[PDB]
Write a protein that binds this ligand. Structure first.
Ligand code: CDL
Ligand code: BCL
Ligand code: BPH
Ligand code: BPH
Ligand code: PC1
Ligand code: PC1
Ligand code: PC1
Ligand code: SPO
Ligand code: SPO
Ligand code: SPO
Ligand code: SPO
Ligand code: FE2
Lengths: 307, 43, 54, 49, 281, 260, 55, 55, 43, 53, 42, 42, 47, 52
């Protein structure tokens, strides 16, 4: 068979790339890490350097504290037994306070207070990471598109953990920390609100998640197909349209009647991915607060057979 | 020292203005806390 | 306390002021929200009960 | 009919994985040990063809 | 009807079947033999969905549903009003999808690019065939496939999932979901990064791939590269579809109970099954 | 606000869904107009502007300030091929293929097409040449995989057409882009790494037959390659896939041609 | 406190000050939330019971 | 034991100090939370029971 | 020595200011703890 | 004996980091195992001995 | 010497570090003695 | 030598490393003896 | 031998022979008949 | 029989041989422990009446 460009057939290694210095404070940037031959078979082999700024330090400390709080709660739930900890790692849960406490911070430490502490740490970590993305874009003079896409993701996350519990007036509405526990929370959220499938915004969120998978498959396949013309160098194709961009555009124009540009396809990409969490946050926010049963709502809106 | 390029006189002037703002903010906060404690003490 | 001004010789006033503003607003919102979440010190519900709005 | 070093190595790794997994699952009290041993052996063999 | 650069690429050749018989364009669309086939199958499927709406008695597009044959019919044919229309529409859909993939192959050959796009579409076609052909055939009835309705195939998904308890506990389902979420995350990151490089702060020069790599290394300490990110996107999407097809092909065929009962195997390993405490103790 | 409807069944959820339909229509309009910044206005098969231009109008032009003082690019803007196209109309009616007048691989038409880009090297962030031969790249060396340097290069006709002398690497990406191949006449051509299959003993190039290796466009400078030269080389090699098909010795192709 | 000043010869004052501020704020919030979690020392509920704010 | 200073010739003092600070804080937090989790040595609950803070 | 670039005088002055701030912080913390212990002892 | 020449083969920095991490993880695992068992759980033992329950 | 600092610098750094460690250990021992007096764990 | 240290340098490094190991072992043995007196496990 | 690479031939042959031998041994152990450990235990009254 | 070293890399063969020998030894020990007979831990436990 021919070379499909999925994996590099040869690796070249040179001096470590220290990166650009547009406005980045080089003191806060670490040193270059090891080169990974395994990673080189697929992408760049170079690890690092990473930027450790003020917001980076805040985010790392808060995320480490969140992770460590969940871990200490799991160790407590394991009876401090390493064998039990490994056996029930996916079954442990840091549950939010019971509904009797509402939004109050008076829940006992083993009955919801530790969840509040961990949630505060996660809140600070995530928002400091968002600020970190924004400032890393700003230091290099790049646009803030990553900051806004992350803001869409943060919107869904805040709705799940913060905004919707407040609107429902109970921390018990929030997502427990734990693998199977938060899966069970997802399932119970669907069951309580009457088949979340009939949430139109959940349907849109699924439409855009499927569209994200479809569009990334299409885009990765297109760029790998035209990489023989240097199509992977997309910024070059934006600045100087080569035969790769033209061939990609013509492929999609002849296939489905319309095409994108080398830059506009990335607008399609960012919006397709953003709308996932945007519509998802809206749909979760509507559930319970505005619609308590989505199947009955769909019946009243011509989405379900009866009524 | 001299990371920000500010001079001692400039830094002292900036600190004076900042402390003036901080004292104003803290005075308003103290008045608010007195009002709340009179309205509903928490101790 | 007389040597505290030297912090401005080290800390960039722009970033310090932005961080201080964000922190103070977030802290004020957090404390007001904590007060609202408790059955007491929820001044809206306190006024509702006091003047028999309900 | 045009198998290279990597392709033949991966095919042999898959055969070794399946065989050792069945063998150790029969030897051990559960199939988890067999699956883990077979997967680790196959991954180690295919890591350096 | 042509782009400013399309003229030099419209040349004979690259066709798989038909030579120059269908080697022409209708507007922007390249027709070809498989394009003729795709259009026929698509028009037939759409007209049969409209006709099934007529038979069902509702014109509301959200209520239109083409149900597969009931389980009493097995894998054989069914009357058109009660399952045969679904079978014909499924055949038309499979023909349209395969013809679309082969038309994409013809277009790839004409343009001289790789066949990554039809190959990636073949994964979606295989997942569809798993849901409508392979799994119902393994289980022995067309009634195990999903109806062709906007909201009734959601009912199929719900019923199939809750047949096995919480479907979240299917491990291949977990892998497929993680791949889907990672793919959406990577697509957001990639679109945002390319846009930020190509649309920097107002008045500043356009950025280079060096700036993108610098940004992502300063952010997460690693940059996969432009070729790397496109490979990653393709592989994430294809792996998500492959593992979803695997999860559905193992469900109801080699697994029949609740999937949490599957997860119980790790708990009941000999060296820690009997230890008290924890959740499962 | 559960069950609170302004009118009929229209509640906050219905308001949200209809407002999102409006927003989605607007977003699709915006995305299509953004995609309409290249290849427009549409043209007829002769070159004149077409009567049909599409429901979506052209967006207002935007300017990219190219790096390293390479000027600016305003899109949409007046764009032309800036190269003769050696194609002849095969039908007066539109929508039919254009047949090459001469040798399409030499003419640069069809799958062998290339674009008249800037005849300047691609630059990295620092301003140096992005793609450089590994001999001229400081510290670069093959780190993993089969080293292609020294291996014979076999064409699609199963005939050796040269040997690999050097690897051209992308300095920022740190990945191989072009293999430099010395032919029988002593001159050197470039082969995209994506069009060569590095095997244990030889480097197989399924796109080009051996006799076509001489026809690959050459680089005017032994140490640098420009965007135009890259485009010409890649177009030639890729067009070899459809235009060197008679010379390709595939067994399946031979059996199909037996019955065709 | 003999020669601890030499730590500033090793550590950048900006990084240390930022890390210390982050650490102190997070620790203070953690301790206050721990106190609010315990039914005792939850000064809001203590005052509510002391002055009979809950009916 | 007199040659222990040479450890600073192998390890960068900045990285070691950062790792040690993080380690010590995490260890102290872990021990305090272990003490809080046990009904005994939960000093807040102990003081609540001793002074009859139950409402 | 050369990791930060500060001199012994500069480092000593910085440490003096930092210790002044730390002692002020510790004094306020001790007063707060005394007030809490008087209001509600935890031992 | 002549074990010192092992440092001619092993990088001291990586070896020391790995040794420290391994020692801490092993010590924590052993302490957690002791805590898990009803015996040797010194907190529970002291609670029963001094009647803390 | 991977770090690069001289032996005098290493000696001074170790002296300061050990002084800090002994101060930390003294505070920890005082705290443990106080806790053991308040509630022994043996 | 993968590390490049001289024989005297490696010897000094291993001597101080063994001093540290013996101190750690001594403390561990004291702790084990204290535990065994307090609660033997054999 | 001419068509196939000797290294691949030897590797495949060795792996297949080992797999077959272990499979036959495990088949013997599984069945009550020809299971040497079980019959030895029964003969010597181990269980 | 020495010519087998003329075809195969001795280092790879030795590594594979070590892994295979360790795997076989572990397999045999696990098989012995699996059956109630020859499980020397269980045999000693029953012989000395450990479970009382
Ligand atoms: C509930 C909602 C909860 C929201 C949570 C937060 C979610 C945030 C999501 C943000 C995603 C941003 C993605 C992005 O990067 O944008 C790229 C892109 C960036 O442009 P750029 O050229 O690259 O900028 C160059 C700069 O030099 C460099 O650009 P830059 O670095 O400075 O940043 C790019 C720009 C991009 O940001 C945006 O443009 C945001 C646009 C609106 C996003 C919010 C949509 C909300 C949808 C709700 C729908 C209703 C539901 C109920 O950012 C901003 O200007 C501020 C964004 C702040 C976001 C705050 C969100 C709140 O964004 C745009 O500017 C274009 C967006 C076009 C949107 C069109 C929508 C049409 C509106 C309806 C039309 C009606 C027509 C009627 C027809 C009906 C016929 C039937
Ligand atoms: C029985 C289960 C229910 C159901 C219940 C729910 C519920 C409940 C929800 C969804 C949601 C979603 N569901 Mg649903 N869902 C069902 C069936 C489906 C089916 C299907 C084929 O059946 C599909 C494809 C989907 C698909 C989807 C997605 C479109 C959507 C989640 C987007 C996302 O990425 O969230 C995951 C992404 C996030 C949560 C964002 C996270 C961002 C933050 C910032 C990340 C922080 C990381 C943290 C710091 C860790 C860092 C680690 C370190 C870096 C190492 N559902 C059925 C009906 N579904 C969500 C939604 O929006 O619905 C409208 C949602 O809340
Ligand atoms: C457009 C919506 C999609 C999306 C977008 C998105 N996520 C993002 C970004 C974007 C654009 C970032 O900029 C940001 C990032 O840095 O990515 C590399 C991030 C990110 N998305 C993350 C995860 C994530 N995103 C998810 C989802 C998605 N993110 C959506 C599908 C999911 C799930 C459940 O599907 C997860 C788990 C992180 C990798 C990162 C945010 C990192 C963060 O906040 O870290 C703080 C926490 C810690 C440091 C804890 C560390 C604990 C231990 C020390 C380890
Ligand atoms: C494998 C990774 C992802 C993927 C990839 C992918 N899909 C692709 C491609 C690729 C790479 C294409 O090249 C091709 C394309 O051209 O896209 C623009 C395609 C495509 N992906 C499509 C959609 C799509 N892909 C999806 C999924 C995915 N596609 C995967 C997640 C999904 C869903 C639900 O997840 C959808 C809806 C199309 C846009 C296109 C294929 C176009 C096509 O086949 O057109 C002919 C068929 C019709 C016009 C349909 C009507 C005629 C039929 C005979 C009737 C069919 C009726 C149907 C059964 C009813 C279903 C009703 C539902 C409500 C149940
Ligand atoms: C990107 C696009 C991805 C689409 C997938 C997402 C689907 C979500 C649709 C939500 C629809 C909804 O909420 O209905 C209630 C909302 C609002 O409620 P409504 O009551 O006002 O409208 C329903 C009208 N009756 C009651 C008569 C049924 O309806 C709409 O917004 C209109 C949606 C129409 C969808 C038609 C799809 C036709 C597709 C062809 C059908 C072929 C079979
Ligand atoms: C029943 C289903 C009907 C399908 C076809 C509807 C045609 C409606 C009338 C179109 C018309 O007057 O223009 C013809 C035109 C022919 O004109 P044209 O293709 O020459 O357009 C030239 C391009 N302009 C004028 C914009 C520069 O056909 C169309 O463009 C049809 C568009 C159909 C859109 C479908 C709905 C989208 C929402
Ligand atoms: C954000 C992601 C939203 C995803 C949901 C929208 C995807 C469908 C996009 C439809 C579209 O772009 O229409 C343009 C195209 C228009 O194609 P066209 O034939 O008229 O040619 C391109 C139009 N000009 C020349 C003006 C740019 O629609 C279709 O061809 C049919 C789409 C059917 C769906
Ligand atoms: C969950 O825990 C709860 C919330 C219950 C308990 C809370 C616990 C915690 C952790 C509480 C935290 C408290 C803290 C740390 C509070 C800090 C407050 C501070 C530091 C406030 C400072 C305020 C200062 C202000 C508002 C200053 C304003 C200044 C100005 C308006 C003027 C600035 C302008 C200048 C300097 C221009 C001069 C410029 C030149 C060039 C000379
Ligand atoms: C789960 O565990 C619980 C929470 C229950 C119990 C908690 C346990 C733990 C682990 C507690 C941890 C406690 C620790 C480690 C506390 C540490 C406290 C420290 C070290 C505090 C230090 C504070 C220092 C301050 C406030 C310094 C302020 C300094 C200034 C205001 C002056 C700054 C300005 C300067 C230096 C001018 C610059 C000078 C020049 C010459 C330019
Ligand atoms: C399932 O099976 C059960 C659990 C039932 C029973 C187990 C069965 C089995 C299969 C057990 C397997 C046992 C095996 C294979 C054990 C193997 C043990 C070995 C290979 C031990 C070797 C130990 C060697 C040591 C610790 C060597 C230490 C060396 C030094 C301290 C000095 C090194 C320094 C040097 C050489 C200086 C460097 C010199 C120069 C010139 C640079
Ligand atoms: C074994 O090694 C150790 C123990 C050292 C470390 C091990 C750690 C382990 C085992 C960690 C395990 C972590 C896991 C399993 C985490 C799972 C996380 C999941 C699945 C989370 C899912 C959803 C979470 C959401 C949606 C969270 C939302 C939170 C927010 C939006 C923030 C809410 C903020 C609040 C409530 C602030 C309240 C506080 C104040 C002061 C206002
Ligand atoms: Fe891209």
């Amino acid at each position: 068979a021919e070379y499909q460009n999925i994996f590099s057939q040869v690796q070249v290694r040179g001096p470590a790339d220290l990166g650009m210095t547009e406005d980045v404070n080089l003191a806060n940037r670490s040193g270059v890490g090891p080169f990974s031959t395994l990673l080189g078979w697929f992408g760049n082999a170079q690890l690092g350097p990473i930027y450790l700024g003020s917001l980076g330090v805040l985010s790392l400390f808060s995320g480490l504290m969140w992770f460590f709080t969940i871990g200490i709660w799991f160790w407590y739930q394991a009876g401090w037994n390493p064998a039990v900890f490994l056996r029930d790692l996916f079954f442990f849960s840091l549950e939010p306070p019971a509904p009797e406490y509402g939004l109050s911070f008076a829940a006992p430490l083993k009955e919801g207070g530790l969840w509040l502490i961990a949630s505060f740490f996660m809140f600070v970590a995530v928002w400091s990471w968002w600020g970190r993305t924004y400032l890393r874009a700003q230091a290099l003079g790049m646009g803030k598109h990553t900051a806004w896409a992350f803001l869409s993701a943060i919107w869904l996350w805040m709705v799940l953990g913060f905004i919707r519990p407040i609107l429902m007036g109970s921390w018990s509405e929030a997502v427990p920390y734990g693998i199977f526990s938060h899966l069970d929370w997802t399932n119970n959220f669907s069951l309580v609100h009457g088949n979340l499938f009939y949430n139109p915004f959940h349907g849109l969120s699924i439409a855009f998640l499927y569209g994200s998978a479809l569009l990334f498959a299409m885009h990765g396949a297109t760029i790998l197909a035209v990489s023989r013309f240097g199509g992977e160098r997309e910024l070059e194709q934006i600045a100087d349209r080569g035969t790769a961009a033209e061939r990609a555009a013509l492929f999609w124009r002849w296939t489905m009647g319309f095409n994108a540009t080398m830059e506009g396809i990335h607008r399609w990409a960012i919006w397709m991915a953003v709308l996932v969490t945007l519509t998802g946050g809206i749909g979760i926010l509507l559930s319970g607060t505005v619609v308590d049963n989505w199947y009955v709502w769909g019946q009243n809106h011509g989405m379900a057979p009866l009524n | 020292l001299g990371y920000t390029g500010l001079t001692d006189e400039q830094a002292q002037e900036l600190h004076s203005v900042y402390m003036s703002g901080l004292w104003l903010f803290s005075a308003v906060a103290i008045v608010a806390h007195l009002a709340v404690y009179i309205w509903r003490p928490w101790f | 306390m007389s040597k505290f001004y030297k912090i401005w010789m080290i800390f960039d006033p722009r970033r310090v002021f932005v961080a201080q503003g964000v922190f103070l607003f977030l802290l004020a919102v957090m404390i007001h929200l904590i007060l609202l979440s408790t059955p007491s010190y929820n001044w809206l519900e306190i006024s509702a009960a006091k003047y028999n709005r309900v | 009919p045009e198998v290279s070093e990597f392709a033949f190595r991966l095919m042999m790794a898959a055969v070794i994985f399946v065989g050792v997994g069945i063998m150790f699952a029969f030897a051990g009290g559960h199939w988890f040990v067999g699956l883990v041993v077979g997967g680790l052996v196959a991954a180690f063999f295919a890591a350096t063809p | 009807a042509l782009l400013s650069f399309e003229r030099k690429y419209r040349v004979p050749g690259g066709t798989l079947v038909g030579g120059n018989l269908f080697d022409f364009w209708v507007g922007p669309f390249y027709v070809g033999f498989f394009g003729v086939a795709t259009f026929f199958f698509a028009a037939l499927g759409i007209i049969l969905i409209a006709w099934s709406a007529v038979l069902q008695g509702t014109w509301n597009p959200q209520l239109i549903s083409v149900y597969p044959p009931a389980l009493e019919y097995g894998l054989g044919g069914a009357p058109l009003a009660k399952g045969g229309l679904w079978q014909i529409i499924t055949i038309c859909a499979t023909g349209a999808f395969v013809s679309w993939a082969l038309r994409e192959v013809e277009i790839c050959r004409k343009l001289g690019i790789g066949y990554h796009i039809p190959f990636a579409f073949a994964f979606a076609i295989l997942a569809y065939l798993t849901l409508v052909l392979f799994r119902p055939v393994m289980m022995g009835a067309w009634g195990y496939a999903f109806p062709y309705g906007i909201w009734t195939h959601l009912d199929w998904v719900s019923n199939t999932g809750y047949t096995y308890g919480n479907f979240h506990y299917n491990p291949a389902h977990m892998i497929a979901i993680s791949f889907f979420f990672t793919n959406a995350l990577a697509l957001a990151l990639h679109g945002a990064l390319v846009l930020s490089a190509a649309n920097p702060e107002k008045g500043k020069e356009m950025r280079t791939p060096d700036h993108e790599d610098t940004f992502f290394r300063d952010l997460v300490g690693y940059s996969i590269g432009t070729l790397g990110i496109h490979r990653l996107g393709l592989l994430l999407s294809l792996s998500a579809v492959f593992f979803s097809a695997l999860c559905m092909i193992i469900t109801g065929t080699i697994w029949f109970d609740q999937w949490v009962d599957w997860w119980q195997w790790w708990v009941k390993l000999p060296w820690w099954a009997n230890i008290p405490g924890g959740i499962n103790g | 606000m559960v069950g609170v409807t302004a009118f009929g069944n229209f509640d906050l959820a219905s308001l949200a869904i209809y407002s999102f339909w409006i927003f989605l229509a607007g977003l699709i309009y915006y995305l299509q107009t953004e995609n309409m910044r290249e290849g427009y206005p549409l043209e007829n098969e002769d070159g004149t502007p077409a009567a049909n231009q599409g429901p979506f109008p052209l967006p207002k032009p935007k300017t990219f300030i190219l790096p390293h003082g390479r000027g600016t690019l305003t899109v949409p803007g007046p764009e032309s091929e800036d190269r003769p196209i050696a194609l002849a109309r095969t039908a007066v009616s539109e929508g039919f293929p254009h047949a090459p007048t001469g040798d399409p691989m030499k003419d640069g038409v069809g799958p062998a097409s290339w674009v008249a880009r800037r005849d300047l090297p691609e630059l990295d962030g620092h301003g140096h040449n992005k793609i450089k031969p590994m001999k001229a790249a400081a510290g670069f060396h093959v780190s993993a995989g089969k080293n292609p340097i020294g291996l014979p290069v076999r064409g699609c006709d199963l005939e050796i057409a040269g040997k690999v002398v050097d690897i051209w690497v992308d300095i920022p990406e740190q990945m191989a882009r072009f293999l430099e191949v010395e032919l029988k006449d002593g001159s050197t051509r470039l082969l995209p790494m994506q069009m060569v299959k590095v095997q244990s003993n030889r480097v197989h190039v399924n796109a080009l037959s051996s006799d076509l290796f001489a026809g690959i466009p050459t680089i005017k400078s032994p140490t640098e390659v420009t965007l135009l030269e890259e485009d010409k080389i890649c177009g030639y090699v890729a067009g070899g896939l459809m235009y060197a098909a008679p010379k390709r010795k595939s067994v399946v192709a031979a059996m199909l041609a037996e019955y065709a």
